[PDB]
Amino acid sequence: TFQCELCSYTCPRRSNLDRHMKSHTDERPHKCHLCGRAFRTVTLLRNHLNTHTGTRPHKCPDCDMAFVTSGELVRHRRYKHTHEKPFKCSMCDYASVEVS
């Protein structure tokens, strides 16, 4: 029912349309007090500051290294600890942690 004007975005929640309009309008009100980089939400700026300094809270349960976000630890476990490999190739027997 809900439709977009800038693109063919179709959702059922008005709040989803609101966020999509915020993405089109690029409301970035969160700057970094070290570099000119800016973001739209607080968690992005929090991770950016957790990269300018070493304050990595997501610790690896199987080794002693760490990362700022969860997805990086997910893929680290699928590379090094639980070799998942969901996506597989066409001809060869290849598979890896990322679609890239």
Site residues, DNA (CB under 7 A): 13-15, 18, 41-43, 70-71, 74, 98-100
Q: Which is nearer to DNA, 32 or 96 (CB)?
A: 96
Structure token digits, residue 16: 């989803």
Place of tokens 């570099």: 35
Q: Which helix (H) or strand (E) holds 31?
A: strand 30-31
The length of the chain is: 100
Distance CA 64, CA 74 (A): 15
Of 16, 41, 62, 71, the one binding Zn ion (CB under 5 A) is: 62
Residue 99 in contact with Zn ion, rule: CB under 5 A: no
Residue 4 in contact with Zn ion, rule: CB under 5 A: yes
Choose from Zn ion, DNA, none: what does 1 bind? Cβ within 5-8 Å by kind: none
Choose from Zn ion, DNA, none: what does 29 bind? Cβ within 5-8 Å by kind: none
Phi-psi region of 35 (alpha: psi -120 to 50; beta: other; left: phi over 0): beta
Question: 45 by DSSP, 3-state: which?
Answer: helix
x-or-dash pattern for Zn ion, window 66-95, by CB under 5 A?
-----------------------x-xx---
